[PDB]
């Protein structure tokens, strides 16, 4: 339910 | 108050996720900031902290309020000092995905991190503590940890080694218990 924040992990 | 954790070196991600899941009452992640406009189903303050203005957030980065920031998909993202402090003041250890550069920034913020480097003994050793990576990536990663240790050695609260990841997780676990 909490976001996976993929953008964030993906960030360089 | 609980010290934030930074694990560096091979396996950091696995170690971090394991810790989070395995002891969610002991460990937490902080809420990152983004300038990307909030999707309707998203919750401000839980999923991300959503900044109205890219100029706004650039200022805070300028103003030093963030320990880490970068751009992705044309939007800013970052970890604020304040969002780390909220976790840590929750009595929880804040699991951080950040560069070793962030540690000087954390020290500087009075937030006294626990910084753990995972030191591979050999190229081959990397492959034995990591199942799912290729030989080329193992190479790229051994050289990586070397350059990291050369530069950042003085920042490490501790350094662990091991034959198996399991051994290492155990070691990382001890170190954390020892500092509290």
XYZ file of C-alpha atoms in Angstrom:
192
model
C 0.000 0.000 0.000
C 2.970 2.247 0.718
C 4.604 3.357 -2.535
C 7.591 1.412 -3.872
C 9.312 4.725 -4.725
C 10.916 3.217 -7.837
C 11.936 6.629 -9.186
C 13.922 7.214 -6.082
C 15.840 3.932 -6.075
C 16.346 4.397 -9.769
C 17.837 7.839 -9.309
C 21.561 8.124 -10.202
C 17.073 8.633 19.600
C 18.410 6.025 17.136
C 21.398 6.396 14.806
C 20.735 6.312 11.043
C 22.368 3.460 9.151
C 24.327 3.632 5.917
C 25.549 0.432 4.381
C 28.026 0.745 1.551
C 29.790 -1.789 -0.634
C 28.409 -4.867 -2.388
C 25.099 -6.202 -1.021
C 24.031 -2.933 0.566
C 20.592 -3.065 -1.077
C 19.937 -6.670 0.002
C 21.159 -5.938 3.500
C 18.957 -2.847 3.660
C 15.786 -4.546 2.444
C 16.371 -7.522 4.698
C 16.771 -5.349 7.751
C 13.664 -3.339 6.898
C 11.457 -6.377 6.457
C 13.057 -8.538 9.156
C 12.863 -5.941 11.914
C 10.343 -3.279 10.879
C 9.886 -2.159 14.494
C 13.650 -1.572 14.741
C 14.207 -0.094 11.255
C 12.606 2.425 8.958
C 13.028 4.353 5.735
C 12.670 8.106 5.531
C 10.210 9.864 3.213
C 12.074 11.323 0.186
C 11.183 14.629 -1.472
C 10.250 14.996 -5.088
C 9.212 17.828 -7.389
C 7.316 15.364 -9.564
C 3.612 16.201 -9.364
C 1.735 13.864 -7.031
C -0.348 11.122 -8.611
C -3.909 11.157 -7.392
C -3.658 7.926 -5.356
C -0.415 9.016 -3.686
C -0.243 10.360 -0.139
C 1.856 13.415 0.657
C 4.081 12.651 3.601
C 3.912 8.858 3.258
C 4.916 7.952 -0.302
C 6.942 11.120 -0.908
C 7.062 14.710 0.242
C 5.779 16.534 -2.807
C 7.342 19.923 -3.495
C 5.270 22.527 -5.353
C 8.250 24.134 -6.995
C 11.512 22.988 -8.480
C 12.954 26.463 -7.696
C 11.719 25.889 -4.121
C 13.609 22.639 -3.679
C 16.731 23.873 -5.467
C 16.843 26.557 -2.799
C 16.712 24.102 0.073
C 19.432 22.022 -1.538
C 21.346 25.269 -1.850
C 20.360 25.973 1.789
C 21.844 22.593 2.816
C 18.542 21.113 4.095
C 19.206 17.888 2.105
C 21.852 15.215 2.669
C 21.351 13.762 -0.835
C 19.688 14.932 -4.056
C 19.662 14.159 -7.745
C 17.547 14.377 -10.842
C 15.477 11.566 -12.314
C 13.033 11.735 -15.173
C 13.689 15.488 -15.147
C 12.456 15.895 -11.528
C 14.411 16.489 -8.349
C 14.412 13.863 -5.599
C 16.348 13.890 -2.374
C 16.619 13.036 1.288
C 16.047 15.916 3.658
C 17.826 16.181 6.966
C 14.453 16.697 8.577
C 12.874 13.506 7.175
C 15.830 11.507 8.520
C 15.515 13.227 11.867
C 11.851 12.245 12.065
C 12.582 8.533 11.701
C 15.505 8.703 14.107
C 13.424 10.622 16.648
C 10.826 7.843 16.193
C 13.297 5.597 18.006
C 13.939 3.854 14.693
C 17.169 3.343 12.789
C 16.912 5.082 9.468
C 18.001 2.889 6.570
C 19.652 5.137 4.015
C 20.479 4.647 0.391
C 23.105 7.358 -0.013
C 26.663 7.949 -1.243
C 29.589 8.050 1.141
C 29.552 11.813 0.519
C 26.337 11.900 2.527
C 28.117 10.783 5.722
C 30.172 13.952 6.080
C 26.799 15.677 5.607
C 25.181 13.557 8.324
C 28.034 14.058 10.761
C 27.769 17.754 9.984
C 24.054 17.655 10.779
C 24.796 16.209 14.223
C 22.943 13.047 13.212
C 25.853 10.725 14.024
C 25.321 7.925 11.460
C 26.359 4.275 11.688
C 28.338 3.698 8.499
C 29.197 0.153 7.513
C 31.459 -0.827 4.661
C 31.292 -4.308 3.186
C 34.800 -5.172 2.033
C 35.289 -7.858 -0.615
C 38.513 -9.788 -0.224
C 38.907 -10.621 -3.906
C 37.065 -10.388 -7.190
C 36.119 -14.032 -6.646
C 34.970 -13.229 -3.110
C 32.408 -10.801 -4.520
C 30.938 -13.628 -6.576
C 30.762 -15.856 -3.485
C 28.871 -13.281 -1.409
C 26.709 -12.389 -4.417
C 24.822 -15.081 -6.371
C 22.822 -13.106 -8.952
C 25.529 -10.925 -10.585
C 27.700 -11.548 -13.651
C 31.468 -11.819 -13.625
C 31.823 -8.441 -15.375
C 29.644 -6.700 -12.816
C 31.599 -8.383 -10.044
C 34.754 -6.884 -11.579
C 33.226 -3.424 -11.903
C 32.082 -3.720 -8.248
C 35.366 -4.929 -6.699
C 37.178 -1.997 -8.296
C 34.373 0.174 -7.044
C 34.719 -0.868 -3.399
C 38.452 -0.364 -3.634
C 38.166 3.246 -4.797
C 35.525 3.699 -2.090
C 37.745 2.415 0.691
C 40.734 4.469 -0.444
C 38.713 7.694 -0.307
C 36.161 7.136 2.412
C 38.006 4.851 4.806
C 38.006 7.432 7.615
C 34.220 7.671 7.469
C 33.477 3.999 8.170
C 32.103 3.237 11.594
C 32.898 -0.385 10.745
C 34.140 -2.772 8.049
C 32.819 -6.317 7.558
C 33.993 -9.266 5.438
C 32.632 -12.747 4.779
C 32.452 -15.898 2.673
C 28.659 -15.870 2.485
C 26.138 -13.024 2.554
C 24.465 -14.822 5.462
C 27.693 -14.563 7.473
C 27.844 -10.896 6.585
C 24.215 -10.129 7.477
C 24.966 -11.692 10.841
C 28.020 -9.440 11.165
C 26.120 -6.325 10.116
C 23.479 -7.254 12.627
C 26.059 -7.500 15.500
C 27.676 -4.185 14.662
C 24.322 -2.409 14.800
C 23.386 -4.058 18.165
C 26.780 -2.992 19.509
C 26.019 0.642 18.755
C 22.926 1.823 20.652
